């Protein structure tokens, strides 16, 4: 139960204490109500059945108290379950944008997906569906045994000795099926990720002919998942048998001692008959625990995933802010070094970019120029060195001010499932319609509206798959230009645009009225006409820099690059 208390909100610990008190009280009332039968039949079968009214009057009060506390326990269990659901999901939602970009490995991306996908009803009603009946079932035979000490001390000892084997079976059942359940969970998660890949990469798989189950990766994941699933069913048989034998052993112990006391005469005959009913109430939890134990293993796996996402390392931050009210800041790399894993992407790159001027970045493929834009934007952070905006290191910047100071046109223009205007408004949702129309006009997106049938309401698919590559690219450009940030990083914003649209967008990037520091990555010389400066980023090093005409006349790497 420790993992749940860790996930409980600090606000909600008071309810958890109240819930735990009522859960124990409910179990005591259940056991006392069961054991009150033994006096009841002793009086009822006697020569004075009027004595049974006392125990019936007490049994009624214990029963109503059982009803009231069980409804309240359900209420508190419901509130605790959803309060944990809302708080953990909100914590993951807030943490994930701050988690380091390198954390999103394919395994970690899967784990984050299933943790978010656990928002459904199975986790919300976790307390009422799983914890409450489990605590009831586990503690009921103990409460019956403690109650039976009043009726007969050695009888209570026998009842509690049955609880010893109950917990013994419960402990061993987990270890028997732990390995199989872990393998089953892993294969299921792989199957989920391959289905998502199957639906996303459908065109490439179809052309590559790896789409049939006999040939596809998803088909192998399904076969492995089926095999792991059958193994889990097989490996749960020891658990079921163990609980069944534990129930039979407790039956033998309880019944054997009851018969021994009955034959010895220390325990009455009608009381011995009542113990049959109490024994059945005593053995019901032995079956309930068996039904609930597999759900515990799945829940432990689920909460491990949620805590793993909440254990992710957030990117470093601070509280610094730029003095400027969105005026153009200078950008400079103070001997920056950065490496994905173990490979050096940047090796001591150093430059200073003026406040209002436009800078171009060019060079061979795989050089590391999106990494430079990512570092300027704070998506990454340097391994060593310090990236400054207007003299303020980005690592110390307030995350709110850090993202408000940069706007990016990404190399692969992802778009969110929704209308076209929603994706443009993501740049600045509070923007005026005049500002939105200007932004879409600048990005040539007005041509899309006057050519697509629905206009700006054209529903985009997952990603930007319901739009052409150039069309989703122009939507991303519109999104970035809408934002009023004073640093605009243009990462191949005209890769998927024809010459006419490429020329129009390139003019619009410089015709934007407000002053910004513009960093442009390009593999088309016609796309960097307006740049005041160039940086030839090759092999992680700025091999040369200067003006376009200056470098072209110099005949260095730049002239060979655009031969």
């Amino acid at each position: 139960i420790r993992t749940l208390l860790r996930l409980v909100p600090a606000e909600k610990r008071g309810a958890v204490a109240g819930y735990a008190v009522l859960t124990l009280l409910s179990v005591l009332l259940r056991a006392v109500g069961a054991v009150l039968l033994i006096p009841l039949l002793a009086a009822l079968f006697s020569d004075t059945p009027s004595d049974a009214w006392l125990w019936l009057g007490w049994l009624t009060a214990v029963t109503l108290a059982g009803w009231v506390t069980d409804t309240n326990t359900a209420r508190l269990g419901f509130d605790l379950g959803f309060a944990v659901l809302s708080r953990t999901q909100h914590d993951m939602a807030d943490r994930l944008p701050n988690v380091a970009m390198s954390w999103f490995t394919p395994d970690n991306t899967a784990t984050a997906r299933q943790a978010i996908a656990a928002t459904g009803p199975e986790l919300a009603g976790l307390v009422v569906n799983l914890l409450t009946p489990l605590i009831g079932a586990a503690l009921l035979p103990a409460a019956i045994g403690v109650a039976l000490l009043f009726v007969s001390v050695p009888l209570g000892l026998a009842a509690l000795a049955g609880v010893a084997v109950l917990f013994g079976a419960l402990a061993l059942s987990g270890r028997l099926s732990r390995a199989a359940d872990k393998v089953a969970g892993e294969t299921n998660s792989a199957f989920t990720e391959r289905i998502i890949e199957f639906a996303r990469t459908q065109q490439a798989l179809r052309a590559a002919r790896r789409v049939e189950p006999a040939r596809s990766q998803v088909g192998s994941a399904l076969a492995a998942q089926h095999g792991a699933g059958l193994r889990l069913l097989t490996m749960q048989i020891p658990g079921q048998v163990l609980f069944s034998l534990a129930g039979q052993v407790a039956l033998i112990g309880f019944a054997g001692m009851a018969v021994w006391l009955t034959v010895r005469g220390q325990l009455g005959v009608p009381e011995a008959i009542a113990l049959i009913v109490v024994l059945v109430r005593y053995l019901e939890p032995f079956a309930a625990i068996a039904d609930l134990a597999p759900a515990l293993e799945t829940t432990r796996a689920t909460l491990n995933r949620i805590q793993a996402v909440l254990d992710a390392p957030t990117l470093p931050a601070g509280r610094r802010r730029l003095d400027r009210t969105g005026a153009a800041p200078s950008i400079e790399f103070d001997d920056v070094r950065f490496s994905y894993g173990d490979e050096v992407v940047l090796d001591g790159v150093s430059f200073t970019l003026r406040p209002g001027n436009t800078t171009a970045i060019v060079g061979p493929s795989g050089s590391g120029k999106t990494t430079i834009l990512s570092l300027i934007a704070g998506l990454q952070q340097p391994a060593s060195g310090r990236v400054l905006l207007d003299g303020v290191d980005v690592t110390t910047l307030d995350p709110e001010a850090r993202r408000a100071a940069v706007s990016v046109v990404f190399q692969h223009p992802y778009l969110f499932d929704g209308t076209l205007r929603d994706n443009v408004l993501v740049g600045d949702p509070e923007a005026d319609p005049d500002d939105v129309t200007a932004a879409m006009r600048l990005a040539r997106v007005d041509e899309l509206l006057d050519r697509l049938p629905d206009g700006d309401a054209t529903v985009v698919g997952e990603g930007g798959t319901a739009l052409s590559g150039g069309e989703r690219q122009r939507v991303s450009i519109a999104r970035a230009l809408l934002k009023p940030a004073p640093v605009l990083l243009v990462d191949e914003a005209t890769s998927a645009l024809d010459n006419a649209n490429e020329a129009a967008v390139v003019d619009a990037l410089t015709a934007d009225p407000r002053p910004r520091t513009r960093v442009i990555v390009a593999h088309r010389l016609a796309s960097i006409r307006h740049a005041d400066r160039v940086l030839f980023v090759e092999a992680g090093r700025v091999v040369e820099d200067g003006a376009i005409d200056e470098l072209l006349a110099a005949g260095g790497r730049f002239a060979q690059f655009w031969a």
Binding site: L40, P97, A124, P213, V277, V280, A466, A496, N499, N501
Partner: protein, 559 residues
Amino acid sequence: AGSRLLAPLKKPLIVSGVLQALITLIELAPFVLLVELARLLLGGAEAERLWTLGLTAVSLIGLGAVLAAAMTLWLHRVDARFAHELRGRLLTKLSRLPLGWFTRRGSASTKQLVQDDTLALHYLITHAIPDAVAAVVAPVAVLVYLFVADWRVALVLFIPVLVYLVLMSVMTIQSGSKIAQAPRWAERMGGEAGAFLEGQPVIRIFGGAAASRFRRRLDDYIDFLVSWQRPFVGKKTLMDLVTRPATFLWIILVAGVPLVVTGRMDPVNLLPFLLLGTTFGARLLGIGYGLSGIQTGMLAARRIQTVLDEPELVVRDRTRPGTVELDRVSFEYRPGVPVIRDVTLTLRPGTVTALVGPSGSGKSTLAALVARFHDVTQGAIRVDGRDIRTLTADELYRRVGFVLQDAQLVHGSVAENIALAEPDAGLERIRTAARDAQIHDRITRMPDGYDSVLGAGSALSGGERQRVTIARAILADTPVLVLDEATAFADPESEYLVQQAINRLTRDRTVLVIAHRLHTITHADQIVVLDDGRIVEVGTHDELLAAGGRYRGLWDSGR
């Protein structure tokens, strides 16, 4: 709809019904013996009779547990095997549906369908029929026994039963609509979660966590769950109180004690109610909690069979080489929204056809139709004279290779990604294909070499992963190639080298090149200018420039 899907489980489900009837009668038999044991135990019978009844009762309890365990084991194996077969059928179905089905549906909704809908069938096809038959047989058998014993105290057992039935009916009525809305809400939240994790750089730059749409819809979904679950769980626990054995035991005594205190009953005849009357409540709770599971299972069956009933890309029986031939092709993704209009285009062996034009004109759709990811609304497309609708996926894709606009890399080693089209290709073939695509050098720099994994988060640069897909298409080595915007993210030096490698390989092949870098396609034997979904002009580079048409405009704008 559901029954047409679950027809193969006719005989297991009928066998489950009858086996549960016998098993639940066997499970009730011990308490009948215990009543007999209790009656003789008050009568002071011989020890042999008491031991015989007691030992038999314990043995029948063991037998009931063994048979119940064997049943649920077998029935769960049957459910597991059916689900594997059903998932296999869905994957085979999705392998031949039109590709617009995926685009309008999304990957999240596909994930719910293949994995979570087949899992939602669980309670219907392994738990529902046992739970219903147990709740029908055992309460009836118990109440018939107790009405034989005493009608006065057997009648009061209708009070918890009637209250349970009323709670069960109003519960199902109240939660019926929400259970129908639930699967679409899960699809929506699955879509938001997938976009939130995939589109993280957009979230980090533009608005952060709080401004994200995911948090808005996450609050909406949790608000839906609360409204669905609070009254549902409230009813669900009231039934638990009503049908609890303690409730039956109390109300039995409330009805029995005033009789026994009076001369209206013998306490020996209260033994059946205490022993039998308390036991059938838990079996009513089965379907009491299972109606929601059956409703969800039926809806999941309807969704699964609806997709399995979806129209697909058939392979007709109607039944030069290397030629591709579009004959008045027209195509629309949405009805009433044309994107190709009356396009005629013949690609011949030993030629390069450059398909240029404005962005969004329809070039990538025309490449897709050559792939038969969709079917044309009009006209025909013929490969080697064989219409593509008469060709299986094997025969069609044996003949046409593709480099797609998006560099989609599957989760796996780099050799797997290059060998996607031919997994059994030798490593030497893979290295030669990577050397041609100018990506072998980068692969040797990677830590593990070719075995290094290309899952998201261990990805490559944009131009590099594009060169991997070009390496994939070169390894397929089909008679026809379709280069849908290769070298878009490549630098001029890499772009020149890979184009030289392509122009070396495809001298005796048909090539369709979609390029916005018009300077790369000037060598094409035919340059097709696709504007507004219709070919506006055709010719060589020099002819198009002299004509002063749309190509001249694009060429001038490129300078």
